DNA sequence: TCGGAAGAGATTCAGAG
RNA sequence: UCCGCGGCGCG
DNA sequence: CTCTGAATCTCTTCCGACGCGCCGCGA
């Protein structure tokens, strides 16, 4: 039925009605002894009607309705992405599910996700009915329903009681690889945003610029045992694509660790001796020494002996206050040398991997959580920030560009004298512009990367710069040499839509203003890339569907 | 309508144990046919089944 | 100099480049095209008159009678625009046409009329564009997107061998009409020429050539060039152009002037050609092999027998040559095949053709076009002729003619819209020339080739469809019956016209629903250009090449504003200055160069002409003489940038910002950031939501004024004067004496849209921003609208931002917000939701609105009146009843035992049930308006009668207040005229106003003016009474509503919504972020003076996204408020205004060579004080897009502000009280809320409804359905060993009609059992497969 | 009441008789 | 309590 | 000079992610 008492007829009903009408017409023309050609025409129409009923559009022009659309025959109910097979037999809609905008929560342990109270109440309403009647607070389902809809705080106590060990599944569309669905043990928060642990968020391929996520609750106890034993994020440390761990920090965590382990030639309290890492932590927190100061410290480490015992060793080593602080969280069994250098992303990755191979799963999990906490805290205390003065422009650049344009004028006038073909003139100009761009990039990196500061004894000495953007790139937290090159050095050649390279490179960097011409020609690459990814997604999805279909039978 | 695309006499009643004629209304006659019409006293689920 | 109004908050410009042309009226395309559509026109060029003349007159031959067209006129729209929006009726006016019917006598000449009848036909109703450029359809705002499509004409195209893949190149030329069949011509890997019609089939071209009235020999003579040979005995001569020799290899000796000279086996070169040309050779003697291998050009006849031995396109058979030479026809004609220049393609087509004659080709074409029927000469001839040459079945519009000629290089510019023989043969010759390689294919993506079609053309096309349908009806009526005893009023049926036009405005793909988040969004949606729609393109078939930027986009289409995702490239926005040429090609302004001095004259160019000339880059520096400083000025020409001397330059760009649209133009510091992020920011800016209180943006772009005024939301001063009166909702302005017209009251009034549902549920409110007695100027803004302050765009808000990682709460673009922001309601927004209640005369008893609800507590009903409607102003929450409605349930017969069971149970099993409207779950708010609409003949209830009474009282008081104000103006004009001389001011003062108007002070033109205004007063009171009578009947009259509904009730619910974690906020440079934490104000980092930060952003995003510009914005913010802070303190100490005056003058002078040059010495001190009052909250800074503030100027401004020169400051962590070792960038930034509030998305379903066919749970939030466990997730589960949860996901939770009941039971009982049945969708699949006639069944039961 | 790839059918060319 | 079709919108 | 097989050409059919959200309309 429809508004106003109308009815939407399914197209199948109309096709059936047409076939019925043609059958009735043919039978009437037969039983009243019609002439030959009339009954032949009627039966040909009937055959065409049956063709329409089964597979309208399979031959010739398709039948159509008032909307000028082709009617969906029976065959169309099974063919195509809207077909019954793909839409319903696979990919069912499901009860006991919710969706919400995700949000960073750093205070969560590894295996627990923050779930809004309202969603929890709605999802577990049947369980709440059950337990509420079981504990005798409600007698009938009507009583339970009216009580839960009034949110009598005893319902909140029951709700806190029910979920205490009840894992839930979190899913992010598209579920590109099996990590896309994971299991978590919920924690109840007021608000309306689902809170994730950032480490697993990195694995989800998710971000926090507004990505939604869906949550399902398992019903049976075998199902929740499966969710705990198989799917819990504490198990999915190793990706299936390769043996390396998937739980790897990025962004602020890596920046914080990098800052914490970087040393400088001269700092507050350099050269003193600390009887233990605890005293290093004290001296830092009391403010009598900066993290970067190099110092000798007494440290104990352990090794897995030939029998399997953690035999101890203790010695004096040269290190930094920050490095001792970080070492204090390291579990027993790893060698101190793992820490005593500027820790980048790859160093942390191999550190987690070596922890997982040397020790069991749970020490690695605890190590990951401690890493996340300490990295965030010390990054915050660091106060790293980016300013306009940081993107230093190498003053050599003007000279190099003047040289390049002089050579361009030289080759152009050489062509004006007819001494060369135009194609080789183009090639020479392109080559000299590329050479100049590389020279400018090298000058920019050299100026940015290192700087001079006074030593303890009162003399100048070079050291790796603490320039913020360089620190972000060098740590591997974010960015790359290409992005830094574009930010400060001249960004160079760009391609016409045909892929050919424009003779005149974009000379201004991002810090100085780009003229309208440079900007306009640059937009070509931007829209090329956006269209590129837009198209690539579909092909990737299609290819994955294929591979899955071919290989789905194979089981050990 | 009788003999129509939705003819209850063929496909069964529109409602559980309700004859089109209104002859019978409850499960006391469950599984019997009406005499005024060929509809059967059964559940609506049969509507999904019968071809 | 500045207007007085603009003296409030004089924004500081920084642009160095002067501006020579103000931005045009932003909506001009829509309004002007619609005006062109509807306005009267004597020449019948466009619109209604053109459409009518293109069909009328209508003549009947057997009837010997004619229908002909006098004129058209458009009636008055019965309803105003706000009435249409309230009552849901399309804003339309009646189409009136003057028509004449003619009957002649039955004797020659047929032109001898005998009777004429004339009358006016109400042939349809047509929508009118509102003043803001949007149509009103039903109850909705709709704006028609102007389409961009391929122009009609002829194009030439090649594929790089992709089809055949052997490495050759294939060519095709296509002709596209405005309407009618396509033709395209194509080559082949075998070099044959083929023609196809609407891409039906593939046929040799000669078929058409002989279908055209040309014979084979004529075809060869026309297409090819001919060479002549002579035979005498057995000596052979040929007649030669020496150039014709070029290309061949001189394998045989060749003679000229009686001497023979050839280097055998060698190719003839230019020295040979010159030798022969100076020889002036004419006829030469050649061997038999040379004439061998040459085609026979035409038929040849032997007179000794009357026989033919030569056919067309035949090779030279030496036997035939001997026979014809002995017969006497010693002359022979042949074609020439240069392997490059003179390909034999047409000859090969003539060889491969199946047809032999004109009629054979005609019938073959007919059977191709019309399969399955016997051909007939008349049928084929009629089909061909009407197809190509019936000017009503096929038409190249005048633009088609222009492009067709100009691509064929013909001198003519105009011509008949139908093709012709010469046109076809010329285009075929051009295609041949392209195949030879003496030309180039056409580039269709080029912007000089595609055309903008506005609303007027689509409207007139649909109206023409209506006209042709009506014409068929009229000719049918003329054929069927008499001609004298009827009037054409009945002959014309309006139904097809109204059907077509309403179908266009409602249904059409380009009639898309309007968006109204903010004035900028409305502007950009009105201006938007779409490549899709009728005759357009499809998202699936759009390849990269149409999406990609084309170098002639510059200055015409903004490259930045395109939407993201699958629609990218296919949707664009007009650049700011681009306007439509009359032919629909885009047009851009330029400044004339005249011998090194820019003339500052303006010329408009299209992509073709722009490509032809040399245009200089905008940022080129100039002297005051107009000479460029640099000699080697950089310019662009023919799609390439280079350097040129001062004299070569032909044109100069008008302004720096002409490459971008408004949406991009708003972004400050655009010249400093990547294109991806700029694109995302430009698109996101549209989604901004208007805040509770507007705020100016500190770092603007000057464009805000133009956009805010040009949009329809703000009330603009249409007539200068002085503001007499203002309240919360009405503005009354006294027009000055000189500006007012004679006989006018000299007073104008405006009424503000106080509160209404926006098209995306946001608020729409107008707030006055003037005070009593302030002068107002023509074009001033009197009342702000949403996101407008003092007439400047006010989308966002100003926030104090520090760039610093903070305890992971800003991890991965997350935003952390200080509670102080929440407490000040900085981002609080007001939302309106509209709910409808429909009362129906349903079967089994009618359904009525009432307060008599069964099975409900009385407290809820107390919120309602006795009629069953909530009182306005009542707070209401989720699950509560707003209006009570009740449905009868039919008989619901109970057996007596069930009757007594019910009786012992209670009042249950009632035949009458609740159906009342309920608050949507989770929503709460306050009820602001209630509306009823009801069918005629039904009684108005208490709520209905009370609201009708209040509405009629409102109408009466409004009309009477208008009367009072306007009569006060009229009598003020009486005073003004009477004081001018012969005064009796006190003698009148004793007399009442009626005496004033009646009495005569003099006997002169003044008394004529008094009489004129007295007649004005009589006329205005009479029109007032007529208006009120019409208003009262219009209010009291009922409504049509819909079938089956007796009465509808609509209730309006308003809700105040608050910033909350999970909400999405973003900044203009395109850095989205979800708010992930609110913080007690104590915990936020605070600077040395103790003022906390408000928003903490992650810095790590900046280098990787390359949004460097935003950092600069931050710095400017810290500078801007800096001055504000200082001036604020300078005000707070209450010192002499002269000191702050000189300080402000310094702050304006601070720029270097800036165009601003504003001086305070002309300002009086109270104006200076008002300026300071507005400047207290910071000094707004204006930075143009590509001529923005430089870093040196930023540093200078900061230094004058006493802030750190680097822009970084020391900072203390509030949570510990310690100090960060690194300096931090803290400044001011402009932030938006993105209308993706968390409470609109959070959703959860334990159980609920289920679908009919599939028995699966419903989908979507509205139906309270569940999420979809898509197949990718199923594969994810399969990757684990997690079988049991998969089985539970499929069977019990989803589709088992009994298993889920069992599961619900067991869960309630506390036992987590499971019992998997069978998915009902599987049974559905089985039944469908069986119904298909294929037997499928289970086995081993 | 569009471009690309693969398969099937039809037509043409070469080799063998 | 509902089959969609078209459209924008965010992932 | 003719017949058959193989090769080539022409015509027809199939396919080009997953997920949510609003609006309109529905002979
Ligand atoms: Mg995302
Ligand atoms: Zn019966």
């Amino acid at each position: 039925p429809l508004d106003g008492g109308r009815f939407a007829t399914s197209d199948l009903n109309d096709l059936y009605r047409r076939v019925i009408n043609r059958n009735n017409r043919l039978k009437r023309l037969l039983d009243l002894a019609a002439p030959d050609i009339i009954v032949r025409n009627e039966k040909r129409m009937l055959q065409e009607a049956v063709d329409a009923l089964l597979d309208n559009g399979r031959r010739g022009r398709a039948i159509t309705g008032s909307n000028k659309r082709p009617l969906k025959s029976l065959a169309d109910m099974i063919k195509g992405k809207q077909g019954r097979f793909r839409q319903n037999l696979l990919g069912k809609r499901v009860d006991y599910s919710g969706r919400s905008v995700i949000t960073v929560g750093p205070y969560l342990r590894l295996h627990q996700c923050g779930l809004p109270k309202k969603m929890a109440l709605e999802l577990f309403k049947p369980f709440i009915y059950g337990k509420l009647e079981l504990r005798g607070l409600a007698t009938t389902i009507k009583a339970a329903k009216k009580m839960v809809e009034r949110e009598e705080a005893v319902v909140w106590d029951i709700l806190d009681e029910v979920i205490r060990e009840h894992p839930v599944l979190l899913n992010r569309a598209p579920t590109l690889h099996r990590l896309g669905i994971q299991a978590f043990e919920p924690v109840l928060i007021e608000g309306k945003a689902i809170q994730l642990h950032p480490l697993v968020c990195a694995a989800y391929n998710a971000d926090f610029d507004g990505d939604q996520m869906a949550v399902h609750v398992p019903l049976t106890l075998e199902a929740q045992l499966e969710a705990r034993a198989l799917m819990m994020s504490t198990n999915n440390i190793l990706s299936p694509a390769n043996g390396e761990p998937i739980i790897v920090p990025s962004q602020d965590v890596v920046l914080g660790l990098y800052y914490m382990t970087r040393d400088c030639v001269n700092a507050k309290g350099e050269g003193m001796v600390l009887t233990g890492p605890k005293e290093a932590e004290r001296l830092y927190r009391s403010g009598l020494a900066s993290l970067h100061a190099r110092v000798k410290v007494r440290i104990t480490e352990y090794e897995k002996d030939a029998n399997g015992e953690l035999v101890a060793k203790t010695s004096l080593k040269d290190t930094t206050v920050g490095r001792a602080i970080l070492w204090m969280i390291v579990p027993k069994g790893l060698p101190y040398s793992i820490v005593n250098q500027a820790l980048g992303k790859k160093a942390i990755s191999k550190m987690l991997n070596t922890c997982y191979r040397i020790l069991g799963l749970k020490p690695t999990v605890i190590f990951a959580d401690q890493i996340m906490y300490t990295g965030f805290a010390y990054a915050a205390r660091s106060g790293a920030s980016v300013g306009i003065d940081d993107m230093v422009i190498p003053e050599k650049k003007h000279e190099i560009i003047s040289e390049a344009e002089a050579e361009v004028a030289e080759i152009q006038e050489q062509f004006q004298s007819g001494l060369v073909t135009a194609g080789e003139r183009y090639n020479k100009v392109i080559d000299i512009w590329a050479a100049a761009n590389d020279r400018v990039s090298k000058a920019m990196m050299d100026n940015l990367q290192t700087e001079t500061v006074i030593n303890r004894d009162g003399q100048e000495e070079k050291q790796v710069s603490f320039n913020s953007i360089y620190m972000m790139a060098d740590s591997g937290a974010r960015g790359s040499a290409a992005q830094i090159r574009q930010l400060a050095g001249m960004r160079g050649l760009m391609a016409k839509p045909d892929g050919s390279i424009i003779e005149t490179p974009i000379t201004a960097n991002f810090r100085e203003g780009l003229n309208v011409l440079q900007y306009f020609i640059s937009t070509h690459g931007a829209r090329k890339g956006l269209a590129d990814t837009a198209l690539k997604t579909a092909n990737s999805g299609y290819l994955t569907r294929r591979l899955v279909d071919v290989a789905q039978d194979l089981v050990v | 309508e009788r003999d129509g695309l939705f003819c209850a006499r063929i496909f069964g009643p529109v409602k559980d144990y309700e004859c089109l004629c209104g002859k019978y209304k409850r499960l006391k006659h469950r599984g019997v046919i009406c005499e005024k019409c060929g509809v059967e006293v059964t559940q609506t689920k049969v509507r999904r089944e019968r071809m | 100099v500045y207007s007085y109004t603009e003296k409030k908050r004089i924004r500081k410009d920084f642009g160095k480049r002067p501006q020579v042309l103000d931005v045009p009226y932003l909506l001009s395309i829509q309004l002007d095209s619609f005006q062109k559509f509807i306005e009267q026109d004597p020449e019948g060029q466009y619109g209604l008159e053109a459409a009518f003349r293109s069909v009328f007159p209508i003549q009947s031959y057997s009837g010997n009678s004619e229908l002909q067209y006098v004129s058209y006129r458009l009636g008055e729209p019965v309803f105003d625009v706000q009435e249409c929006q309230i009552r849901g009726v399309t804003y339309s006016a009646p189409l009136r046409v003057k028509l004449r019917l003619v009957i002649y006598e039955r004797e020659a000449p047929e032109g001898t009329v005998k009777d004429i009848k004339e009358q006016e036909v109400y042939m349809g109703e047509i929508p009118l564009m509102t003043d803001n450029g949007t149509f009103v359809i039903n109850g909705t705002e709709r704006v028609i997107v102007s389409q961009l499509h391929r122009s009609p004409g002829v194009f030439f195209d090649s594929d790089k061998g992709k089809t055949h893949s052997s490495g050759k190149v294939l060519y095709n030329a296509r002709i596209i009409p405005y309407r009618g069949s396509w033709l395209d011509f194509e080559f082949d890997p075998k070099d044959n020429l083929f023609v196809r019609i609407d891409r039906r089939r593939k046929l040799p071209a000669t078929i058409i050539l002989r279908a055209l009235n040309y014979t084979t020999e004529q075809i060869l003579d026309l297409f090819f060039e001919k060479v002549i040979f002579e035979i005498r005995d057995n000596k052979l001569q040929m007649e030669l152009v020496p150039e014709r020799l070029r290309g061949e290899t001189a394998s045989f000796d060749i003679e000229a002037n009686g001497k023979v000279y050839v280097e055998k086996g060698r190719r003839i070169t230019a020295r040979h050609i010159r030798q022969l040309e100076k020889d002036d050779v004419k006829l030469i003697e050649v061997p038999v092999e040379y004439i061998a291998g040459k085609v026979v050009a035409k038929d040849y006849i032997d007179e000794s027998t009357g026989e033919l031995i030569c056919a067309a396109n035949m090779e030279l058979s030496l036997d035939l040559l001997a026979k014809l030479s002995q017969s006497g026809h010693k002359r022979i004609e042949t074609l020439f095949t240069n392997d490059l220049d003179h390909g034999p393609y047409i000859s090969e087509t003539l060889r491969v053709d199946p047809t032999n004659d004109r009629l054979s080709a005609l019938v073959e074409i007919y059977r191709m076009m019309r399969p399955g029927e016997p051909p007939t000469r008349e049928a084929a001839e009629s089909l061909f002729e009407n197809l190509f040459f019936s000017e009503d079945r096929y038409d190249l519009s005048a633009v088609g003619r222009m492009k067709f000629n100009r691509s064929l290089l013909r001198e003519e510019i105009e011509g008949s819209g139908i093709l012709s023989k010469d046109d076809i043969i010329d285009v075929m010759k051009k295609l041949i020339d392209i195949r030879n390689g003496k030309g180039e294919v056409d580039d269709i993506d080029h912007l000089g080739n595609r055309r903008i079609r506005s609303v007027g053309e689509m409207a007139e096309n649909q109206f023409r469809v209506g006209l042709v349908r009506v014409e068929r009806a009229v000719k049918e009526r003329l054929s069927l019956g008499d001609l004298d005893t009827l009037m054409p009023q009945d002959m014309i049926n309006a139904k097809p016209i109204s059907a077509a036009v309403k179908e266009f405005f409602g249904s059409s793909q380009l009639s898309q629903f309007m968006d109204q988040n903010n004035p900028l969004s409305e502007i950009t949606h009105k201006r938007r250009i779409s490549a899709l729609g009728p005759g357009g393109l499809t998202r699936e078939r759009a390849g990269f090449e149409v999406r990609d930027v084309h170098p002639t986009h510059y200055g015409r289409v903004c490259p930045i504003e395109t939407p993201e995702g699958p629609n990218i490239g296919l949707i664009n926005s007009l650049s700011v200055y681009a306007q439509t040429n009359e032919y629909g090609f885009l047009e851009t302004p330029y400044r004339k160069v005249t011998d090194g001095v820019v003339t500052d004259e303006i010329h408009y160019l299209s992509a073709i002409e722009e490509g032809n000339y040399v245009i200089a880059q905008a940022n080129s520096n100039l002297d005051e003489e107009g000479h460029f400083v640099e000699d080697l000025v950089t310019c662009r020409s023919k799609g390439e940038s280079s350097l040129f001397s001062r004299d070569q330059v032909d044109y100069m760009d008008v302004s720096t910002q002409q490459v971008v649209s408004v949406g991009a133009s708003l972004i400050p510091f655009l010249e400093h950031d990547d294109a991806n992020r700029a694109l995302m920011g430009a698109n996101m800016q549209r989604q901004a939501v208007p805040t509770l209180r507007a705020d100016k943006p500190l770092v603007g772009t000057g464009m805000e004024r133009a956009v805010a005024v040009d949009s329809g939301v703000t009330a603009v001063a249409k007539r200068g004067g002085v503001v007499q009166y203002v309240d919360a909702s009405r503005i009354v302005i006294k027009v000055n004496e000189d500006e007012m017209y004679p006989g006018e009251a000299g007073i104008d009034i405006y009424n503000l849209t106080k509160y209404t549902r926006s098209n995306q549920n946001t608020c729409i409110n107008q707030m006055p921003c003037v005070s009593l007695g302030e002068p107002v100027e023509r074009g001033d803004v009197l009342a702000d609208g949403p996101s407008t302050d003092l007439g400047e765009l006010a989308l966002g808000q100003n926030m104090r931002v520090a760039f610093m990682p903070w305890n992971g709460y800003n991890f991965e673009d997350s935003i952390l917000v200080s509670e102080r922001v929440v407490q000040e309601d900085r981002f609080t927004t007001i939302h309106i939701q509209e709910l409808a209640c429909v009362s129906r005369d349903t079967k089994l008893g009618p359904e009525e609105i009432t307060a008599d609800i069964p099975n409900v507590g009385e407290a809820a009903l107390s919120k309602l009146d006795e009629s069953g409607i909530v009182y306005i102003g009542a707070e209401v929450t989720g699950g509560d009843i707003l209006v009570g409605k009740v449905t009868p349930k039919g008989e619901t017969q109970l057996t007596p035992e069930e009757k007594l069971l019910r009786a012992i149970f209670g009042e249950k099993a009632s035949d009458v049930k609740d159906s009342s409207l309920r608050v949507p779950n989770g929503v709460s708010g306050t009820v602001i308006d209630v509306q009823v609409f009801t069918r005629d003949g039904v009684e108005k209830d208490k709520r209905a009668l009370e609201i009708e009474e209040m509405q009629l009282k409102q109408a009466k008081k409004d009309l009477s207040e208008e009367l009072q104000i306007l009569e006060a103006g009229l009598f003020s004009r009486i005073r003004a005229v009477l004081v001018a001389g012969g005064v009796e001011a006190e003698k009148l003062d004793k007399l009442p106003r009626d005496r004033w108007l009646e009495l005569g002070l003099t006997d002169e033109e003044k008394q004529n003016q008094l009489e004129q205004l007295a007649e004005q007063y009589d006329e205005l009171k009479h029109e007032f009474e007529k208006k009120l009578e019409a208003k009262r009947r219009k209010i009291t009259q009922g409504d049509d509503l819909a079938p089956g509904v007796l009465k509808i009730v609509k209730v309006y619910l308003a809700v105040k919504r608050r910033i909350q974690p999970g909400d999405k906020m973003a900044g203009r440079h395109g850095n989205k972020g979800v708010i992930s934490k609110i913080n007690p104000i104590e915990d936020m980092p605070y600077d040395e003076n103790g003022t906390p930060v408000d928003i903490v952003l992650n810095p790590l995003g900046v280098p990787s996204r390359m949004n460097i510009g935003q950092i600069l914005e931050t710095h400017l913010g810290m500078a801007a408020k800096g001055i504000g802070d200082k001036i604020n303190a300078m005000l707070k100490q209450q010192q002499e205004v002269a000191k702050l005056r000189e300080f402000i003058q310094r702050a304006y002078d601070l720029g270097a060579d800036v165009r601003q040059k504003v001086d305070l010495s002309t300002f009086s001190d109270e104006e200076v004080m008002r300026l300071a009052e507005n400047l207290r909250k910071g000094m707004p800074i204006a930075t143009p897009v590509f001529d923005g503030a430089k870093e040196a100027e930023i540093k200078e401004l900061l230094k004058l502000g006493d802030l750190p020169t680097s822009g970084q400051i020391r900072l203390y962590d509030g949570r510990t009280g310690e100090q960060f070792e690194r300096p931090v960038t803290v400044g001011y930034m402009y932030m938006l809320k993105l209308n993706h509030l968390v409470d609109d998305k959070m959703h959860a379903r334990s159980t609920g409804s289920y679908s009919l066919v599939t028995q699966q749970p419903l989908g979507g939030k509205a139906q309270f359905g569940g999420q979809r466990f898509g197949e990718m997730e199923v594969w994810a589960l399969e990757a684990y060993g997690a079988a049991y949860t998969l089985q539970e996901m499929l069977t019990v939770k989803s589709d088992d009609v009994n298993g889920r009941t069992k599961m619900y039971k067991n869960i309630v009982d506390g036992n987590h059992q499971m019992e998997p049945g069978m998915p009902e969708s599987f049974n559905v699949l089985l039944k469908e497969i069986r119904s298909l006639g294929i037997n499928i069944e289970l086995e081993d039961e």
Side-chain angles (χ1 to χ4, degrees), chain B residues 19-21 23 34-37 39:
Chain B
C19 205
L20 221 68
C21 319
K23 299 300 300 177
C34 162
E35 305 302 329
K36 275 66 180 176
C37 78
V39 87

Side-chain angles (χ1 to χ4, degrees), chain C residues 123-147:
Chain C
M123 86 186 320
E125 274 282 344
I126 190 159
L128 269 61
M129 173 174 297
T130 63
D131 189 24
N132 290 337
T134 173
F135 303 104
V136 177
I137 304 307
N138 306 326
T140 65
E141 308 90 317
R142 274 186 163 92
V143 47
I144 309 306
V145 178
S146 57
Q147 193 188 43

Side-chain angles (χ1 to χ4, degrees), chain C residues 467-481:
Chain C
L467 282 191
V468 300
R469 298 305 299 159
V470 171
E471 184 217 329
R472 292 184 184 175
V474 167
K475 73 198 308 176
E476 179 72 0
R477 180 53 190 81
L478 287 172
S479 69
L480 72 86

Side-chain angles (χ1 to χ4, degrees), chain C residues 1030-1045:
Chain C
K1031 173 63 65 172
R1032 77 166 66 178
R1033 69 88 190 150
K1034 183 176 179 178
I1035 294 294
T1036 52
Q1037 68 186 57
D1039 311 306
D1040 54 354
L1041 302 183
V1045 48

Side-chain angles (χ1 to χ4, degrees), chain C residues 975-990:
Chain C
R975 306 302 187 274
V977 77
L978 84 91
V979 296
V983 304
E984 303 182 345
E986 298 186 334
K987 181 262 197 174
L988 270 47
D989 185 47
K990 60 178 178 178

